Paper text:
Arp2/3 complex is composed of seven protein subunits and nucleates the formation of actin filament branches on the sides of preexisting “mother” actin filaments. Like actin, Arp2/3 complex is an ATPase. ATP hydrolysis and release of the γ-phosphate from Arp2 and/or Arp3 regulate the turnover and mechanical stability of branched filament networks.
A 2.7 Å resolution structure with ADP bound to the actin subunits in the mother and daughter filaments, ADP bound to Arp3 and ATP bound to Arp2 reveals several functionally important parts of Arp2/3 complex absent from lower resolution structures. This structure serves as a reference standard for the mature branch junction. All 8 actin subunits and Arp3 have well defined densities in their active sites for ADP and a coordinated Mg2+ ion. The map shows clearly that Arp2 has bound nucleotide triphosphate that is consistent with Mg2+-ATP, although incomplete occupancy of the γ-phosphate suggests that partial hydrolysis and phosphate dissociation may have occurred. At 2.7 Å resolution, Arp3 D-loop residues 39-57 are disordered as in previous structures, but we also visualize weak density for the D-loop C-terminal region (residues 58-67) in the branch junction. The mother filament is bent where it associates with Arp2/3 complex in the ADP branch junction. Arp2/3 complex binds on the convex side of the bent mother filament. The majority of filament bending (~1°) occurs between subunits M2 and M3, while the remainder is distributed between subunits M3–M6. Most of the twisting is localized near subunits M2-M4 where bending is observed, and the cumulative twist difference is ~ +0.9° over the full range of the bent filament segment (subunits M1-M6). In the branch junction with bound ADP contacts of Arp3 with the mother filaments bury 187.4 Å2 on actin subunit M4 and 393.5 Å2 on actin subunit M3, a total of 581 Å2.
Author numbering:
A (entry chain A): 2 to 39, 66 to 427
B (entry chain F): 1 to 168
C (entry chain D): 1 to 219, 221 to 317
D (entry chain O), F (entry chain Q): 6 to 375
E (entry chain G): 2 to 152
């Protein structure tokens, strides 16, 4: 492999985190959005991305998010997003560098195939590793890079903008049969905040204002009928949020029960959706109880949080208490049949200083390894087998 | 386009239309299953002989045929390295859409640029004279499509040259 | 983008943040650039003090062409001892900044512009020596041919600035000539790059851009570079020549001309990549034309009425 | 399927994409009681909509929320849209995309509030706003022509050549069937009959819809009526008393050809059509003259197509064939062409979607619906 | 692992092509002599300018077999050389007077010619294909699809 | 068979060597839509070329890639060449050697770039670039004469004696049919007709082709047209409107004899033809005067050969005969002569072959062609 630093690109549904292996942060963290125009033809040169795309809606560009619900679904826009990432922001030559890419555990064979042909034929990268994204978020949880600080067994709950998935990993191996996914994350709680501002007919219900009300005003409560009652009993529970309009004037928004009812989307997904029903503490139980019996203590002892939509105030404490309730009720059913007390299991949900970008920090830490260039597809593999080299699922069991 | 291609595309049309006498046929090697027999080859009595129609050493058809399936594969004009790149990538976008063009393969057979599989079900559920019209209209136009793409590539190479060289 | 930025965008945004910031956090950031260049940005002793260091494989050649003198002239009191594994370094102290937002902005710009400033010294050496030769040729126009013939060999700069590009340049009394001994090693970029290099030279023959530097192209080397060490006439290099005349490096235009000529092969490389995205949209547009030729084989049938989620509907 | 809602100034016309005709067609009216509600219970309501307002009208003040193609009252327009979805079509609007319509040269805010109410009040999955005359050209089976569309509140001319609209040549005229109804009230007053209330304005609209017609030569018809009983005929009011009228039958529609009858300084609908053709580039004019398409209820008068052809033949050079296309279904051509458009497969990519509105706000309509 | 071991190829032997098509009732040297008598007649008919009689005589016998590729390719060299020397105006009058078996042999050997363009001129074989299919119909190609694999 | 193209400055003439006339003759034009397509499912194309651009011109801006015999837009020229091959002649460019054609005294870059595009973009097997005036002698059956060739973009004189050209006596005049269309648009304005757009220019080109002629004595014709309406004619626009035309009917073509009408300091076509003969060696002049050949569309005006013989007879010495050969097919004589040349057995070693180009580069054309 080349001696140049690998380039790390976590392309999320909400945000892309771009940087180089071994740095103390991503070089860029900006929305996974493209601004596109809607006698020589140049409208495919005229686009913008990230923070510079958000500035272009008033100039008549159509904004789009080429990743939705965790999966790339517009390969024209994702190719233009990557070329602009590589040549504007990272300012790099693909021929000199190995790349770490990411996508959700479910992601189609078709997506890794389409990713490999853009990377090896459009850009001609030296080599590509498409990582299992929340497996990197386990490695970001270490107290330091030294081997004695590693905890190679843990459940990881990743919750970004587009999807939340719970991954069991034990001794560094991903138990792919036990992956659970909930199709609801940080964007669906924004659409719920937006919908509640809109039901009150508030002066502003733009998407940025609903987003900023999540980041600043929202938190996870114990129980929504007790918390609705606390919003009768105590008057300063309602906040006032000052927002500036697209046409440049002030507004003031009263923010109310969406402060607790919007983060409740994870703990009662029947608020968000007709199609998904199991709450996150029961969904994490289903991951560990489908997983092999000898790893269950290790998977409960280390439940790592990952992705921006896990950062709600009191989120890890609600998950820990509700999962500890599920776990001890199941252990006590067995103690009451057997007539003897167990040792129990400690359920620990872990929030940590790198939790916001744990996939990128893990990708950086794993791409720093001396062995890394041997796990990549090299362009010499792609010259023989084409994009079919990337098609086989890494995380799940394959037939053949 | 068809003055130079006319003798060739008439031979392709006539023999593709002879070859599409397809039928429902279940497997003799697997029970309660049917498979496109040209694509599996496990029972040779229901394979018809493979026929090559050719204009040139570089411009060729292979027609492979069976009781319930035809596989049709083509080599297309690539007279320079720009056309070798442009053809390969155009066929990859076209075969990437194969679920919506129901008679496309997702991969060509080795040594061919694009390939088609017409099965019994396609001759039952689609107008088979319009299937062979789509094959011949694809063969008639693809050389004009690819040559126009190398005009667009020339036109962009001029755009960046004039934009660059005019800001001294 | 139709054109590349000249400066490192990360260094510009980071310094524009830290020069404004109320409370600077620490940093430890290795940052890549084009042509194998790399930067290290860090706070190695205090959060208050940022060290920016450049690594560049041709820096020893550039020092022979007066680079340290230009970097001391540009960065002044901020110049620092080189960091280990880096060729040049600058220390900026966040409590020692200029008194205005506009001086801070042009300092954040100046430090982001550092790759093109280290690489500008051979071009300033050629422009300032052309002004000496211009004055001598203005003194005696019949001695000028011999001054130009000796300056073509005695005042030539070659920079082997990456393993597949040599930039060669020299002054004569009315011009600076610069030759890019240029190559693409990736085979699809060599094929598209032949079209880009051909249409580049043919563009300069059209009436609309006669105001530009003269351009010439070949794939043996220009006569006056044939015996420069590391130029080789069979080794798949093309040779793009620019003749900058006095009007292309007039005092209002020198620094833009330097910035813009250094990025030549980088704009060509970038546009050879971006042309693939253009070809791909050209392709999938006529995949959608060929759909309509297959759609005429679908026999016409009415589908049942469905709601937006695809659930069946029972009305009309 | 998708809803098509041609919410015009005088009638709401609504239904489903791919249907032969609108299955909901009702007055674009909200009615509110103007009298002492003395009996307790009695099935009384705070307001009434459409055919319920039109049948109760003797006790209601009637008002249209839309005038000259512009929504003037959004609270009553939401009341009308609610009546379309829940009462008249009997659908969940959150299950169906909706194709809406408006006249050209409307206020920008009309399109914005119309998209906002569809996504935020009615929770629609997707919507689009079409120009009404562009819809009427699909209902003609044509891809070139000039469409003269005249409804209740607005008349407009849109020229289209080979699917390209010429937006500089588009004409609007804020004169249509409501101005003709108001003028029929003003001239009925001269023969002896006063119609004054918003309820009596519906009686004289019904007189206009079956007594009135367009004369081929107005001064000959005016002289023929001034000298004979033969143009005179009668109508019976709800009260059973009889109205007889004569030259009022063709003087009312003549206001489309002579807007000065209502004090307007504008060309008539014939000369406005010719002025739109003459604003188009010289090569397209021949095919516009051969394709004058009539639309909307104010084009339903007897003799108006024969008059329009006579008048445009005098303005155009004699060297070419003027043809006026006036289908018997032209009462609904905007809705018919909306049901064509909403059923096309490329149009399925042209919708503004819920997700795309939520990301962009109501300004998304100005950069997607033209 | 067991999944990849081919048991079917040894436990259930499939039909061979000679179970479908009857064995050739002539030896390799017997057919090689029979063709070696015809090729000199086919060459001689070109020199007298009677290439139509050159085909009518060459077409009176056809070699087949996987044991005879050398004499099959020599017969195909003579067939394409004969077809290249017939004038394009004579083809319609000749095709309508061929038997169904002679037509079946012509459309079979123009197909063997079209399979190898670096040896054979496709332009004349496609001209013959157009005229033979125009006059005798689609069924002549259907007989080639159905034909023996060692022709 | 070879291909032959006169890529003229106004028409493409294309076809096969040994045929009697061009197979394809069409406008050397690319048209692009200026308006927005409002109608879904229409056959909307990114650009149109030739007769399809000319047919659709009311919605297109029209551009010619060739100006004054120089290719100014290489992308639109490549669109025209692609249209000649794949749509008009419908043959693949790799299959036939192509005879292209050019005016004398062109930029050397025009011929090199034309050569590079045929060999590397269209991958032609062999090609040649002939001088248009040399081909006009092949069509005329001559090996001696002076050709006055005048197309859409350039007028030129080439004197040839017994197969030898005299390249010092060659004359170019960047004034031909397009400059006469520009001037007819300008002098139509003074009778009150406004033609401005790129499509109205094509109507004025048709007015010039249908009605203009060369007046044998301009001041007697100006006095005649001032005295009576007998010189006036009428033309009907695509709008069905009629325009009537008088002295501007012959004052337009007089710009060939009086270039100062369009403000340019140069000799008229008679004086450039005489100056070309007077640059030749004294013994050949006597035979050049008898062998004036006229070619191209701008030589098609009624009366131009009579005017041209009158003016050359006034310049030349009266002791010897002036004869001008202006044949009725002269509109296609460059192509006809290219079909003759590419058909000669003695020409088949004169092609630039692809194998001979890619050992020399596109400068091969300057040593294989005149
Ligand atoms: N403090 C916070 N509290 C709650 N949600 C947050 C917070 N900070 C960021 N988010 C939300 O996290 C999501 C982005 O997380 P990220 O991990 O970057 O998602 P992704 O990788 O899928 O694009 C957005 O919905 C964002 O608004
Ligand atoms: N038969 C008719 N004769 C005259 N006027 C008619 C006729 N039918 C309808 N109208 C008039 O047309 C108008 C309604 O037409 P419509 O196209 O539905 O308008 P809108 O779309 O703007 O609501 C009313 O003024 C109505 O009285
Ligand atoms: N009958 C005519 N009378 C006058 N001018 C003509 C006539 N026919 C054509 N033209 C002019 O000549 C041009 C075409 O002549 P042509 O010889 O084909 O020119 P070119 O080779 O440059 O394309 C037309 O575009 C028009 O300007
Ligand atoms: Mg994410
Ligand atoms: Mg209306
Ligand atoms: Mg010409």
């Amino acid at each position: 492999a080349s001696f140049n630093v690998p380039i790390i690109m976590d392309n999320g549904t909400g945000y892309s985190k771009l940087g180089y292996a071994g740095n103390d942060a991503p070089s860029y963290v900006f929305p996974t959005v493209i601004a596109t125009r809607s006698k020589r033809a140049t409208e495919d040169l005229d686009f913008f991305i990230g923070n510079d795309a958000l500035k272009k809606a008033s100039a008549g560009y159509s904004l789009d998010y080429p990743i939705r619900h965790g999966q790339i679904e517009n390969w024209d826009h994702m190719e233009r997003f990557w070329q602009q990432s590589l040549f504007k922001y990272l300012r790099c030559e693909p021929e000199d560098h190995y790349f770490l890419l990411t996508e959700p555990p479910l992601n189609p064979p078709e997506n890794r195939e389409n990713t490999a042909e853009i990377m090896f034929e459009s850009f001609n990268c030296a080599g590509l590793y498409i990582a299992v994204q929340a497996v990197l978020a386990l490695a970001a949880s270490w107290t330091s890079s030294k081997v004695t600080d590693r905890s190679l067994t843990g459940t990881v709950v990743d919750s970004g903008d587009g999807v939340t998935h719970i991954i069991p990993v034990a001794e560094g191996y991903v138990i792919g049969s036990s992956i659970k996914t909930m199709p609801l994350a940080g964007r669906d709680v924004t659409y719920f905040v937006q919908s509640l501002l809109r039901d009150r007919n508030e002066p502003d219900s733009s998407l940025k204002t609903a987003e900023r009300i999540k980041e600043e005003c929202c938190y996870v409560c114990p129980d929504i009928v007790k918390e609705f009652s606390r919003f009768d009993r105590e008057p300063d529970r309602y906040l006032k949020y000052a927002s500036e309009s697209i046409t440049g004037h002030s507004t003031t928004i009263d923010v109310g029960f969406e402060r607790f009812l919007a983060p409740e989307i994870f703990f009662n997904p029947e608020i968000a959706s007709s199609d998904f029903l199991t709450p996150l503490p029961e969904l994490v139980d289903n991951v560990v109880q489908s997983s092999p019996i000898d790893v269950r203590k290790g998977l409960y002892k280390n439940i790592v949080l990952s992705g921006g939509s896990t950062l709600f105030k009191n989120f890890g404490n609600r998950l820990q208490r509700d999962l500890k309730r599920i776990v001890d009720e199941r252990i006590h059913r067995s103690e009451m049949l057997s007539g003897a007390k167990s040792g129990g299991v400690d359920v620990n949900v872990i929030s940590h200083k790198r939790q916001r970008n744990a996939v990128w920090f893990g990708g950086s830490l794993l791409a720093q390894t001396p062995e890394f260039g041997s796990y990549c597809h090299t362009k010499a593999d792609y010259e023989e087998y084409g994009a079919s080299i990337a098609r086989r699922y890494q995380i799940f069991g394959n037939s053949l | 386009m068809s003055n130079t291609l006319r003798p060739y595309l008439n031979a392709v049309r006539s023999t593709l239309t002879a070859s599409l006498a397809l039928e429902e046929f279940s497997s003799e090697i697997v029970e309660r299953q049917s498979q496109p027999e040209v694509e599996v080859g496990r029972s040779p009595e229901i394979l018809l002989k493979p026929l090559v129609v050719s204009r040139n050493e570089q411009e060729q058809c292979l027609i492979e045929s069976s009781v319930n399936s035809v596989r049709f594969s083509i080599r297309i004009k690539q007279v320079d390295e720009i056309e070798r790149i442009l053809v390969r990538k155009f066929m990859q976008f076209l075969m990437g859409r194969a679920e919506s063009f129901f008679i496309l393969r997702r991969k060509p057979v080795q040594g061919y640029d694009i390939s088609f599989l017409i099965t019994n079900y396609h001759t039952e559920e689609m107008l088979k004279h319009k299937l062979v019209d789509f094959i011949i209209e694809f063969m008639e136009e693809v050389d004009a499509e690819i040559s126009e793409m190398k005009l667009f590539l020339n036109g962009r190479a001029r755009l960046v040259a004039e934009t660059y060289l005019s800001c001294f | 983008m139709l054109s590349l930025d000249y400066n490192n965008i990360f260094i510009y945004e980071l310094l524009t943040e830290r020069f404004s910031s109320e409370n600077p956090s620490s940093i430890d950031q290795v940052v890549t650039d084009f042509d194998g260049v790399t930067f290290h940005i860090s706070t190695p002793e205090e959060k208050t003090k940022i060290l920016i260091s450049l690594s560049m494989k041709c820096y020893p050649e550039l020092v022979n062409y007066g680079t340290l003198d230009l970097l001391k002239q540009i960065y002044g009191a901020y110049v620092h001892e080189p960091e280990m594994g880096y060729n040049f370094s600058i220390l900026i102290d966040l409590q020692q900044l200029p008194a205005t937002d506009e001086e801070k902005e042009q300092l954040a710009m100046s430090i982001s512009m550092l790759k093109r400033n280290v690489l500008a010294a051979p071009f300033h050496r050629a422009f300032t020596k052309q002004a000496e030769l211009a004055d001598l040729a203005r003194k005696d126009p019949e001695n000028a041919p011999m001054l130009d013939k000796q300056a073509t060999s005695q005042e030539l700069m070659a920079i082997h600035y990456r393993d597949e590009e040599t930039i060669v340049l020299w002054p004569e009394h009315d011009r600076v000539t610069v030759v890019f001994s240029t190559k693409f090693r990736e085979e699809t970029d060599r094929i598209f790059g032949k079209v880009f290099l051909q249409e580049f030279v043919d563009a300069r023959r059209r009436p609309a851009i006669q105001t530009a530097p003269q351009v010439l192209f070949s794939y043996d080397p220009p006569l006056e570079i044939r015996d420069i060490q590391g130029i080789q006439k069979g080794d798949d290099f093309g040779f793009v020549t620019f003749v900058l005349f006095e009007r292309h490096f007039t005092p209002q235009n020198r620094e833009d001309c330097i910035s813009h000529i250094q990025v030549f092969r980088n704009t060509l490389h970038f546009h050879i990549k971006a042309s693939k995205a253009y070809m791909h949209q050209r392709m999938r547009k006529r995949v959608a034309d060929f759909q309509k030729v297959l759609n005429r084989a679908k026999p016409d049938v009415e589908l049942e009425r469905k709601t937006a989620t695809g659930r069946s509907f029972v009305r009309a | 399927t998708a809803l098509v809602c041609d919410n015009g100034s005088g009638l709401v016309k609504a239904g489903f994409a791919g249907d032969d005709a609108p299955r909901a067609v009702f007055p674009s009216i909200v009615g509110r009681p103007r009298h002492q509600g003395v009996m307790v219970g009695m099935g009384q309501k705070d307001s009434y909509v459409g055919d319920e307002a039109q049948s109760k009208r003797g006790i209601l003040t009637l008002k249209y929320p839309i005038e000259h193609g512009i929504i003037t009252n959004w609270d009553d327009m939401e009341k009308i849209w609610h009546h379309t979805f829940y009462n008249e079509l009997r659908v969940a609007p959150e299950e169906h995309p909706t194709l809406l319509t408006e006249a050209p040269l409307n206020p920008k805010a009309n399109r914005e509030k119309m998209t906002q109410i569809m996504f935020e009040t009615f929770n629609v999955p997707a919507m689009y706003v079409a120009i009404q005359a562009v819809l009427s050209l699909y209902a003609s089976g044509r891809t070139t022509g000039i469409v003269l569309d005249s409804g209740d509140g607005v008349t407009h001319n849109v020229p289209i050549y080979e699917g390209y609209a010429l937006p500089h040549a588009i004409m609007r005229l804020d004169l249509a069937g409501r101005d003709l109804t108001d003028y029929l009230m003003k001239i009925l007053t001269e023969r002896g009959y006063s119609f004054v209330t918003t309820a009596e304005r519906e009686i004289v609209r019904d007189i206009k819809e079956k007594l009135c017609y367009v004369a081929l030569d107005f001064e000959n018809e005016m002289a023929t009526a001034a000298s004979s009983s033969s143009l005179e005929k009668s109508y019976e009011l709800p009260d059973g008393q009889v109205i007889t009228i004569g030259n009022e039958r063709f003087r009312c529609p003549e206001t489309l050809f002579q807007p000065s009858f209502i004090g307007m300084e504008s060309a008539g609908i014939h000369e406005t059509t010719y002025n739109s053709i003459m604003k188009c580039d010289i090569d397209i004019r021949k095919d516009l003259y051969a394709n004058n398409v009539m639309s909307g209820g104010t084009t339903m008068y007897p003799g108006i197509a024969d008059r329009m052809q006579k008048e445009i033949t005098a303005l155009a050079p004699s060297t070419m064939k003027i043809k006026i296309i006036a289908p018997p279904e032209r009462k609904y051509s905007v809705w018919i062409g909306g049901s064509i458009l909403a059923s096309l497969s490329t149009f399925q990519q042209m919708w503004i979607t819920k997700q795309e509105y939520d990301e962009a706000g109501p300004s998304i309509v100005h950069r997607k619906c033209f | 692992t067991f999944r990849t071991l081919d048991v079917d190829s040894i436990t259930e032997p499939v039909l061979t092509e000679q179970d479908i098509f009857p064995i050739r009732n002539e030896t390799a040297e017997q057919v090689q002599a029979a063709v070696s008598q015809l090729i000199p007649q086919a060459r001689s008919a070109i020199q007298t300018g009677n290439a139509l009689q050159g085909l009518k005589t060459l077409l009176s016998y056809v070699p087949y077999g996987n044991d005879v590729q050398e004499v099959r390719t020599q017969y195909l060299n003579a067939f394409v050389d004969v077809l290249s020397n017939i004038r394009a105006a004579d083809i319609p009058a000749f095709v309508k007077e061929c038997s169904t078996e002679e037509i079946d042999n012509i459309v079979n050997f123009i197909y063997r010619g079209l399979a190898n363009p670096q040896a054979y001129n496709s332009s004349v074989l496609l001209n013959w294909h157009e005229k033979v299919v125009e006059i005798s119909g689609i069924g002549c190609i259907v007989r080639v699809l159905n034909s023996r694999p060692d022709l």
